């Protein structure tokens, strides 16, 4: 199976698999059952921002999800990615709906990763920023129901002609270039990701969430990973 590390913005409480009884953010290490969560006061129809950071000094994955003029939700988990992920990975956003649904619109996405060698103390770096998404955006690998074009946005899951989000949808966007996320010969390794998102549910019954994830390079949507599986995991283990 794929190897997945993710920060989930989980809008739908799946209590039978360990979600708390509220929308939450979580750190997922190789399981949809988050190693750490924090309550998140999701605001239907409002643009939010998620920021994810990790560095190899502290080896601590943290995320903050906020809306303008509201208290943020923050979650952090100590994890040595050297021991979890392969050296080379792809990074992406994923989202899903199930019986219930929501738009999973990404308005912008930025990422920076840096690796400083122990041998030379010089740094390799990758940065991309998308503040608009184009039709046929060739530096993104779109998977499942993900599309770009409309409003200059990235719609991770399916939205109908009238703007209604559809259920049982899953889709992901991965940056095209593999990222050298860790290396033993590195003094400091670090990455940050930021994306802005618009989650909208008419019936005020949102599901299932958005995730930033890091994966093996050839990662694909696990078959059937709609709903609570967030397009990330083949099961709920």
């Amino acid at each position: 199976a794929d190897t997945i590390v993710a920060v989930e913005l989980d809008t739908y409480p799946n209590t039978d698999i360990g979600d708390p009884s509220y929308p939450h953010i979580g750190i997922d290490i190789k399981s949809v059952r988050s190693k750490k969560t924090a309550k998140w006061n999701m605001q239907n129809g409002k643009v939010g921002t998620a920021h994810i950071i990790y560095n190899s000094v502290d080896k601590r994955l943290s995320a903050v999800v906020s809306y303008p003029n509201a208290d943020s939700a923050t979650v952090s988990y100590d994890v040595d990615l050297d021991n979890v992920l392969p050296e080379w990975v792809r990074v992406g956003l994923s989202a899903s709906t199930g019986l219930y649904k929501e738009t999973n619109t990404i308005l912008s996405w930025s990422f920076t990763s840096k690796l400083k060698s122990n041998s030379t103390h010089e740094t390799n770096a990758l940065h991309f920023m998308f503040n608009q998404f184009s039709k046929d955006q060739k530096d993104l690998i779109l998977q499942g129901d993900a599309t770009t074009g409309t409003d200059g946005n990235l719609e991770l899951t399916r939205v109908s002609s009238n703007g209604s989000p559809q259920g049982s949808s899953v889709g992901r966007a991965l940056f095209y270039a593999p990222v050298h996320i860790w290396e033993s010969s590195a003094v400091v390794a670090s990455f940050e990701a930021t994306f802005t998102f618009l989650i909208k549910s008419p019936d005020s019954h949102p599901a299932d969430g958005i995730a930033f994830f890091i994966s093996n390079i050839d990662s694909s949507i696990p078959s059937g990973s709609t709903g609570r599986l967030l397009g990330l995991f083949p099961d709920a283990n």
């Binding site: 739908y12 409480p13 799946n14 209590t15 019986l99 219930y100 019936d203 019954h205």
Partner: peptide, 4 residues
């Protein structure tokens, strides 16, 4: 069926 959490909403339900």
């Amino acid at each position: 069926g959490w909403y339900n």
